[PDB]
Amino acid sequence: TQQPIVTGTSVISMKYDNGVIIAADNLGSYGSLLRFNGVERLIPVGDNTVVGISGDISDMQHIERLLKDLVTENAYDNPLADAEEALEPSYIFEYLATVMYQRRSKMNPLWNAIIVAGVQSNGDQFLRYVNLLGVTYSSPTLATGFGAHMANPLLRKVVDRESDIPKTTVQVAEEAIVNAMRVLYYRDARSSRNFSLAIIDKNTGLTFKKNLQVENMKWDFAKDIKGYGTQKI
Amino acid sequence: GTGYDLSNSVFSPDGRNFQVEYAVKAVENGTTSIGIKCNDGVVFAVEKLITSKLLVPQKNVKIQVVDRHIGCVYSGLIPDGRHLVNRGREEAASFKKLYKTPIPIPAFADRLGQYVQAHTLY
């Protein structure tokens, strides 16, 4: 049993007609102190999977190392490591889910919430969540922490059920996610303006975008708000 | 007297370890394999005897990778070869885990060296 020290906030994601999108800001908080700003919380594995992690950062770094080892190991005595026997997004998730549940069962968890986003070899979209309790689930949209409360409602207005997936384009989807990131920056006190976003398309492959920023924010109306009730000036 | 060649870690009167020498015979009886160091890398190659037309071509790979930067090929008892590479892989992962940097080839060599030397002590 432990307690998280350096933490990463929300990880939001969703799937569209040809793939999945996943994003996460670049902050590493230390309680109320916004301590680190160059933190990458999106972990690409191969070119068909991206693992987004929130929660304890030291544990994230540990999971990172676990992931690199998976890749190294899978290549051992594997002439098809970059083909028929390359790591599938579903293998990566099952592995992490197994570790997460084993660790919680030993009462020594990896204090994280994880979303594995990717595209299977047959083209199918893959989006599944696993957390420190070993709990797992799938939905057209997935978000951790604060994003679960504010991002899911927005992303679900785009893809409210399975049938909405084939009707959603990368443009529409990426737009939703980028809007959600801005909302989170407005109401989440542990968020950052800078974030990374990744797209995994069954045709265009893995596109990883770094150093994005929340733009087009509305603050002007703030000048009109004075006092907390009766004050006029 | 005699019998110095029946047990593995025994010194014969002339200071030799006959069991190791007999192991060498197993090696000389094996397929030929080589390595050539170039100006910025190394090349490994080996002979794969085709026992019959039944062996699927290109399938029974012999060269093995350790970590992501080391190549290994051997002659002799193949299973012993795999055994040694498995150890090498653990040895490499352990090194990276503690020091972060992938294991230097010289360091990797002594790891394999100490392990093999260990099998001539008992």
GROMACS .gro file of C-alpha atoms in nm:
model
  355
    1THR     CA    1   0.000   0.000   0.000
    2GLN     CA    2   0.125   0.342  -0.092
    3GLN     CA    3   0.026   0.695  -0.181
    4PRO     CA    4   0.082   0.875  -0.512
    5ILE     CA    5   0.334   1.159  -0.506
    6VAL     CA    6   0.399   1.305  -0.852
    7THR     CA    7   0.078   1.275  -1.055
    8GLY     CA    8  -0.062   1.316  -1.405
    9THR     CA    9  -0.426   1.417  -1.448
   10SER     CA   10  -0.683   1.316  -1.718
   11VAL     CA   11  -0.632   1.095  -2.023
   12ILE     CA   12  -0.919   1.126  -2.273
   13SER     CA   13  -0.988   0.922  -2.586
   14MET     CA   14  -1.245   0.800  -2.837
   15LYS     CA   15  -1.275   0.604  -3.156
   16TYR     CA   16  -1.386   0.728  -3.499
   17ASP     CA   17  -1.452   0.547  -3.829
   18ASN     CA   18  -1.091   0.456  -3.910
   19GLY     CA   19  -0.916   0.452  -3.574
   20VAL     CA   20  -0.882   0.598  -3.228
   21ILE     CA   21  -0.761   0.924  -3.075
   22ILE     CA   22  -0.599   0.970  -2.734
   23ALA     CA   23  -0.462   1.280  -2.559
   24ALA     CA   24  -0.306   1.386  -2.227
   25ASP     CA   25  -0.150   1.709  -2.100
   26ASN     CA   26   0.219   1.735  -2.012
   27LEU     CA   27   0.198   1.807  -1.643
   28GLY     CA   28   0.342   1.622  -1.346
   29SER     CA   29   0.186   1.762  -1.030
   30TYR     CA   30   0.316   1.738  -0.674
   31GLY     CA   31   0.006   1.796  -0.467
   32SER     CA   32  -0.107   2.153  -0.535
   33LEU     CA   33   0.234   2.235  -0.687
   34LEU     CA   34   0.242   2.219  -1.069
   35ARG     CA   35   0.603   2.095  -1.054
   36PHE     CA   36   0.698   1.937  -1.389
   37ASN     CA   37   0.597   2.052  -1.735
   38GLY     CA   38   0.777   1.837  -1.989
   39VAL     CA   39   0.603   1.514  -1.897
   40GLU     CA   40   0.492   1.284  -2.178
   41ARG     CA   41   0.209   1.058  -2.058
   42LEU     CA   42   0.127   0.899  -2.392
   43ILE     CA   43   0.337   0.587  -2.455
   44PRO     CA   44   0.360   0.460  -2.810
   45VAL     CA   45   0.425   0.087  -2.845
   46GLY     CA   46   0.522  -0.013  -3.195
   47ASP     CA   47   0.310   0.167  -3.452
   48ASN     CA   48  -0.041   0.043  -3.375
   49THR     CA   49  -0.070   0.122  -3.005
   50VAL     CA   50  -0.055   0.417  -2.767
   51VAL     CA   51  -0.082   0.379  -2.389
   52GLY     CA   52  -0.205   0.685  -2.199
   53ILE     CA   53  -0.132   0.692  -1.825
   54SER     CA   54  -0.262   0.902  -1.535
   55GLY     CA   55  -0.182   0.870  -1.167
   56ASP     CA   56   0.156   0.821  -1.001
   57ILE     CA   57   0.437   0.923  -1.233
   58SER     CA   58   0.705   0.702  -1.078
   59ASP     CA   59   0.477   0.404  -1.150
   60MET     CA   60   0.418   0.535  -1.505
   61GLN     CA   61   0.794   0.536  -1.563
   62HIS     CA   62   0.795   0.181  -1.432
   63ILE     CA   63   0.519   0.081  -1.674
   64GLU     CA   64   0.715   0.249  -1.952
   65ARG     CA   65   1.009   0.023  -1.881
   66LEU     CA   66   0.777  -0.277  -1.872
   67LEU     CA   67   0.648  -0.181  -2.216
   68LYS     CA   68   0.994  -0.140  -2.370
   69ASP     CA   69   1.083  -0.486  -2.238
   70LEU     CA   70   0.773  -0.634  -2.396
   71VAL     CA   71   0.891  -0.506  -2.734
   72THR     CA   72   1.247  -0.632  -2.682
   73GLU     CA   73   1.128  -0.973  -2.564
   74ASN     CA   74   0.870  -1.016  -2.841
   75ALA     CA   75   1.149  -0.971  -3.093
   76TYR     CA   76   1.349  -1.260  -2.944
   77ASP     CA   77   1.359  -1.563  -3.178
   78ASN     CA   78   1.069  -1.402  -3.364
   79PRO     CA   79   1.135  -1.367  -3.739
   80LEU     CA   80   0.786  -1.217  -3.770
   81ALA     CA   81   0.830  -0.952  -3.498
   82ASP     CA   82   0.756  -0.676  -3.748
   83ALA     CA   83   0.478  -0.864  -3.924
   84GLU     CA   84   0.236  -1.142  -3.827
   85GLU     CA   85   0.391  -1.169  -3.481
   86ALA     CA   86   0.423  -0.804  -3.387
   87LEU     CA   87   0.263  -0.681  -3.063
   88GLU     CA   88  -0.112  -0.627  -3.099
   89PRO     CA   89  -0.284  -0.354  -2.896
   90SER     CA   90  -0.496  -0.624  -2.733
   91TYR     CA   91  -0.188  -0.817  -2.617
   92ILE     CA   92  -0.043  -0.507  -2.457
   93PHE     CA   93  -0.363  -0.439  -2.270
   94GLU     CA   94  -0.416  -0.793  -2.146
   95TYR     CA   95  -0.060  -0.782  -2.015
   96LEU     CA   96  -0.105  -0.455  -1.827
   97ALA     CA   97  -0.447  -0.562  -1.697
   98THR     CA   98  -0.284  -0.875  -1.561
   99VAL     CA   99  -0.011  -0.680  -1.387
  100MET     CA  100  -0.253  -0.423  -1.246
  101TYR     CA  101  -0.478  -0.687  -1.093
  102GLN     CA  102  -0.185  -0.889  -0.955
  103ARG     CA  103  -0.039  -0.580  -0.791
  104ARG     CA  104  -0.369  -0.479  -0.630
  105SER     CA  105  -0.409  -0.837  -0.513
  106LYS     CA  106  -0.075  -0.817  -0.332
  107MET     CA  107  -0.195  -0.492  -0.175
  108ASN     CA  108   0.086  -0.302  -0.350
  109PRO     CA  109  -0.075  -0.132  -0.655
  110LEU     CA  110   0.061   0.068  -0.946
  111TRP     CA  111  -0.133   0.386  -0.866
  112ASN     CA  112  -0.257   0.451  -1.218
  113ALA     CA  113  -0.551   0.467  -1.456
  114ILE     CA  114  -0.459   0.351  -1.806
  115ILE     CA  115  -0.619   0.367  -2.150
  116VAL     CA  116  -0.481   0.152  -2.428
  117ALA     CA  117  -0.564   0.288  -2.772
  118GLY     CA  118  -0.477   0.125  -3.100
  119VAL     CA  119  -0.576  -0.063  -3.412
  120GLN     CA  120  -0.572  -0.441  -3.437
  121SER     CA  121  -0.410  -0.617  -3.734
  122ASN     CA  122  -0.752  -0.685  -3.889
  123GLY     CA  123  -0.818  -0.311  -3.878
  124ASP     CA  124  -1.051  -0.316  -3.575
  125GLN     CA  125  -1.032  -0.022  -3.335
  126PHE     CA  126  -0.915  -0.099  -2.982
  127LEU     CA  127  -0.994   0.110  -2.678
  128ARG     CA  128  -0.994  -0.033  -2.326
  129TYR     CA  129  -0.929   0.097  -1.974
  130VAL     CA  130  -0.759  -0.056  -1.668
  131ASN     CA  131  -0.679   0.102  -1.330
  132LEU     CA  132  -0.500   0.041  -0.999
  133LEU     CA  133  -0.782  -0.192  -0.888
  134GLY     CA  134  -0.751  -0.417  -1.192
  135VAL     CA  135  -1.092  -0.298  -1.312
  136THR     CA  136  -1.138  -0.290  -1.692
  137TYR     CA  137  -1.397  -0.172  -1.941
  138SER     CA  138  -1.457  -0.050  -2.297
  139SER     CA  139  -1.674   0.224  -2.445
  140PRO     CA  140  -1.671   0.435  -2.766
  141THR     CA  141  -1.518   0.708  -2.549
  142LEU     CA  142  -1.293   0.669  -2.242
  143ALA     CA  143  -1.145   0.920  -2.002
  144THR     CA  144  -0.976   0.902  -1.660
  145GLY     CA  145  -1.004   1.126  -1.356
  146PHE     CA  146  -1.153   1.467  -1.430
  147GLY     CA  147  -1.194   1.384  -1.797
  148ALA     CA  148  -1.442   1.113  -1.704
  149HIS     CA  149  -1.670   1.381  -1.565
  150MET     CA  150  -1.622   1.654  -1.823
  151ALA     CA  151  -1.478   1.494  -2.136
  152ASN     CA  152  -1.703   1.189  -2.167
  153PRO     CA  153  -2.021   1.400  -2.177
  154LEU     CA  154  -1.878   1.606  -2.465
  155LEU     CA  155  -1.723   1.319  -2.660
  156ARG     CA  156  -2.043   1.119  -2.618
  157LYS     CA  157  -2.239   1.392  -2.794
  158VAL     CA  158  -2.037   1.284  -3.099
  159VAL     CA  159  -2.030   0.907  -3.050
  160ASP     CA  160  -2.321   0.820  -2.820
  161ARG     CA  161  -2.329   0.452  -2.919
  162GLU     CA  162  -2.153   0.198  -3.139
  163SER     CA  163  -2.339   0.290  -3.460
  164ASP     CA  164  -2.201   0.644  -3.439
  165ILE     CA  165  -1.842   0.522  -3.491
  166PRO     CA  166  -1.859   0.465  -3.869
  167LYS     CA  167  -2.024   0.807  -3.902
  168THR     CA  168  -1.741   0.991  -3.726
  169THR     CA  169  -1.442   1.136  -3.911
  170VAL     CA  170  -1.090   1.204  -3.783
  171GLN     CA  171  -1.158   1.576  -3.822
  172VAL     CA  172  -1.476   1.569  -3.615
  173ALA     CA  173  -1.319   1.338  -3.356
  174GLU     CA  174  -0.994   1.532  -3.320
  175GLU     CA  175  -1.198   1.849  -3.286
  176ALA     CA  176  -1.399   1.706  -2.997
  177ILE     CA  177  -1.087   1.592  -2.815
  178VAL     CA  178  -0.915   1.927  -2.863
  179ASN     CA  179  -1.223   2.107  -2.733
  180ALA     CA  180  -1.240   1.873  -2.433
  181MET     CA  181  -0.876   1.945  -2.353
  182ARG     CA  182  -0.962   2.315  -2.337
  183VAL     CA  183  -1.260   2.255  -2.108
  184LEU     CA  184  -1.039   2.053  -1.872
  185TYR     CA  185  -0.794   2.344  -1.864
  186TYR     CA  186  -1.079   2.570  -1.753
  187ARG     CA  187  -1.216   2.361  -1.466
  188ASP     CA  188  -0.940   2.114  -1.362
  189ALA     CA  189  -0.700   2.279  -1.115
  190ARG     CA  190  -0.433   2.018  -1.185
  191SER     CA  191  -0.424   2.058  -1.564
  192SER     CA  192  -0.180   2.216  -1.807
  193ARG     CA  193  -0.226   2.412  -2.129
  194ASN     CA  194   0.031   2.196  -2.308
  195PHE     CA  195  -0.061   1.848  -2.418
  196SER     CA  196   0.018   1.564  -2.655
  197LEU     CA  197  -0.231   1.394  -2.885
  198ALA     CA  198  -0.201   1.076  -3.086
  199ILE     CA  199  -0.402   0.929  -3.370
  200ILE     CA  200  -0.392   0.566  -3.475
  201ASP     CA  201  -0.559   0.521  -3.812
  202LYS     CA  202  -0.587   0.187  -3.991
  203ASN     CA  203  -0.476   0.366  -4.309
  204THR     CA  204  -0.247   0.654  -4.209
  205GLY     CA  205  -0.095   0.465  -3.915
  206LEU     CA  206   0.026   0.627  -3.595
  207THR     CA  207   0.043   1.006  -3.585
  208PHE     CA  208   0.193   1.148  -3.266
  209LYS     CA  209   0.153   1.523  -3.211
  210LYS     CA  210   0.363   1.693  -2.942
  211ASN     CA  211   0.356   2.044  -2.792
  212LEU     CA  212  -0.008   2.125  -2.868
  213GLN     CA  213  -0.172   2.409  -2.676
  214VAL     CA  214  -0.517   2.511  -2.565
  215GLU     CA  215  -0.616   2.804  -2.787
  216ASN     CA  216  -0.926   3.013  -2.857
  217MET     CA  217  -1.019   3.065  -2.493
  218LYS     CA  218  -1.298   3.294  -2.374
  219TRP     CA  219  -1.194   3.519  -2.083
  220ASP     CA  220  -1.309   3.869  -2.191
  221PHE     CA  221  -1.647   3.835  -2.017
  222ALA     CA  222  -1.442   3.831  -1.694
  223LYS     CA  223  -1.402   4.211  -1.710
  224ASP     CA  224  -1.779   4.245  -1.669
  225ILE     CA  225  -1.786   4.044  -1.345
  226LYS     CA  226  -1.722   4.250  -1.031
  227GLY     CA  227  -1.794   4.178  -0.665
  228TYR     CA  228  -1.983   3.871  -0.546
  229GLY     CA  229  -2.334   4.012  -0.528
  230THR     CA  230  -2.417   4.377  -0.452
  231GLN     CA  231  -2.087   4.549  -0.542
  232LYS     CA  232  -2.122   4.774  -0.848
  233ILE     CA  233  -1.764   4.880  -0.930
  234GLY     CA  234   4.695  -4.325  -1.288
  235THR     CA  235   4.394  -4.257  -1.513
  236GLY     CA  236   4.029  -4.154  -1.497
  237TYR     CA  237   4.104  -3.782  -1.482
  238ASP     CA  238   3.872  -3.736  -1.780
  239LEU     CA  239   3.561  -3.884  -1.617
  240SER     CA  240   3.467  -3.592  -1.392
  241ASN     CA  241   3.424  -3.231  -1.510
  242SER     CA  242   3.622  -3.011  -1.273
  243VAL     CA  243   3.925  -3.237  -1.235
  244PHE     CA  244   4.281  -3.127  -1.314
  245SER     CA  245   4.477  -3.399  -1.496
  246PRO     CA  246   4.847  -3.441  -1.400
  247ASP     CA  247   4.944  -3.199  -1.679
  248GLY     CA  248   4.695  -2.938  -1.555
  249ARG     CA  249   4.418  -2.993  -1.810
  250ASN     CA  250   4.041  -3.032  -1.781
  251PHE     CA  251   3.970  -3.314  -2.026
  252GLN     CA  252   3.592  -3.273  -2.008
  253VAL     CA  253   3.627  -2.922  -2.149
  254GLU     CA  254   3.850  -3.061  -2.423
  255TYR     CA  255   3.588  -3.324  -2.508
  256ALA     CA  256   3.330  -3.047  -2.523
  257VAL     CA  257   3.550  -2.878  -2.783
  258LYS     CA  258   3.519  -3.195  -2.992
  259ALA     CA  259   3.142  -3.150  -2.992
  260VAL     CA  260   3.205  -2.801  -3.129
  261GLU     CA  261   3.445  -2.907  -3.405
  262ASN     CA  262   3.186  -3.159  -3.514
  263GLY     CA  263   2.937  -2.880  -3.558
  264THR     CA  264   2.837  -2.657  -3.847
  265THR     CA  265   3.068  -2.371  -3.938
  266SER     CA  266   2.980  -2.016  -3.831
  267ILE     CA  267   3.171  -1.688  -3.843
  268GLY     CA  268   3.183  -1.320  -3.766
  269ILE     CA  269   3.354  -1.028  -3.938
  270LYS     CA  270   3.412  -0.694  -3.769
  271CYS     CA  271   3.376  -0.400  -4.010
  272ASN     CA  272   3.448  -0.026  -3.990
  273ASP     CA  273   3.128   0.050  -3.796
  274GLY     CA  274   2.965  -0.282  -3.711
  275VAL     CA  275   2.980  -0.659  -3.727
  276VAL     CA  276   2.843  -0.930  -3.954
  277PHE     CA  277   2.746  -1.282  -3.853
  278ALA     CA  278   2.689  -1.576  -4.086
  279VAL     CA  279   2.645  -1.950  -4.051
  280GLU     CA  280   2.607  -2.274  -4.248
  281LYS     CA  281   2.270  -2.451  -4.222
  282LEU     CA  282   2.297  -2.811  -4.345
  283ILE     CA  283   1.988  -2.919  -4.538
  284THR     CA  284   1.924  -3.269  -4.403
  285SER     CA  285   1.644  -3.310  -4.656
  286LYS     CA  286   1.389  -3.134  -4.877
  287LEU     CA  287   1.149  -3.162  -4.584
  288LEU     CA  288   1.313  -2.881  -4.385
  289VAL     CA  289   1.108  -2.568  -4.452
  290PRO     CA  290   1.350  -2.317  -4.610
  291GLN     CA  291   1.440  -2.001  -4.419
  292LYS     CA  292   1.252  -2.128  -4.111
  293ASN     CA  293   1.494  -2.286  -3.864
  294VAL     CA  294   1.680  -1.964  -3.778
  295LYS     CA  295   2.007  -2.009  -3.591
  296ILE     CA  296   2.143  -1.660  -3.529
  297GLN     CA  297   2.001  -1.503  -3.213
  298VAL     CA  298   1.965  -1.149  -3.089
  299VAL     CA  299   2.027  -1.041  -2.731
  300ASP     CA  300   1.863  -0.714  -2.625
  301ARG     CA  301   1.845  -0.507  -2.942
  302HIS     CA  302   2.211  -0.452  -3.030
  303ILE     CA  303   2.384  -0.791  -2.988
  304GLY     CA  304   2.406  -1.078  -3.234
  305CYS     CA  305   2.499  -1.434  -3.137
  306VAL     CA  306   2.578  -1.742  -3.341
  307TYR     CA  307   2.737  -2.069  -3.229
  308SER     CA  308   2.866  -2.410  -3.340
  309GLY     CA  309   2.816  -2.734  -3.152
  310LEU     CA  310   2.517  -2.855  -2.952
  311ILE     CA  311   2.243  -2.613  -3.055
  312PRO     CA  312   2.041  -2.653  -2.732
  313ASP     CA  313   2.349  -2.553  -2.532
  314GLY     CA  314   2.365  -2.247  -2.756
  315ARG     CA  315   2.010  -2.140  -2.680
  316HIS     CA  316   2.071  -2.200  -2.308
  317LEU     CA  317   2.367  -1.961  -2.315
  318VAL     CA  318   2.169  -1.693  -2.503
  319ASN     CA  319   1.881  -1.715  -2.256
  320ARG     CA  320   2.130  -1.642  -1.981
  321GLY     CA  321   2.277  -1.364  -2.192
  322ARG     CA  322   1.934  -1.208  -2.231
  323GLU     CA  323   1.870  -1.213  -1.854
  324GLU     CA  324   2.218  -1.078  -1.799
  325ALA     CA  325   2.147  -0.794  -2.046
  326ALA     CA  326   1.802  -0.707  -1.908
  327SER     CA  327   1.942  -0.698  -1.555
  328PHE     CA  328   2.219  -0.463  -1.667
  329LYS     CA  329   1.980  -0.224  -1.843
  330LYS     CA  330   1.733  -0.234  -1.555
  331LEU     CA  331   1.994  -0.111  -1.307
  332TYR     CA  332   2.210   0.113  -1.527
  333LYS     CA  333   1.951   0.225  -1.787
  334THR     CA  334   2.198   0.207  -2.074
  335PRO     CA  335   2.196  -0.109  -2.289
  336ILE     CA  336   2.488  -0.339  -2.200
  337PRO     CA  337   2.831  -0.268  -2.359
  338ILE     CA  338   2.962  -0.561  -2.567
  339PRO     CA  339   3.276  -0.605  -2.358
  340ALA     CA  340   3.065  -0.617  -2.042
  341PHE     CA  341   2.825  -0.858  -2.210
  342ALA     CA  342   3.112  -1.083  -2.311
  343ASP     CA  343   3.244  -1.122  -1.957
  344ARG     CA  344   2.890  -1.202  -1.842
  345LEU     CA  345   2.880  -1.493  -2.086
  346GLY     CA  346   3.240  -1.571  -2.004
  347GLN     CA  347   3.191  -1.595  -1.627
  348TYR     CA  348   2.881  -1.808  -1.673
  349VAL     CA  349   3.058  -2.056  -1.904
  350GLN     CA  350   3.370  -2.060  -1.684
  351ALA     CA  351   3.135  -2.147  -1.396
  352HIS     CA  352   3.041  -2.470  -1.574
  353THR     CA  353   3.402  -2.592  -1.544
  354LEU     CA  354   3.414  -2.553  -1.164
  355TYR     CA  355   3.195  -2.847  -1.054
   0.00000   0.00000   0.00000
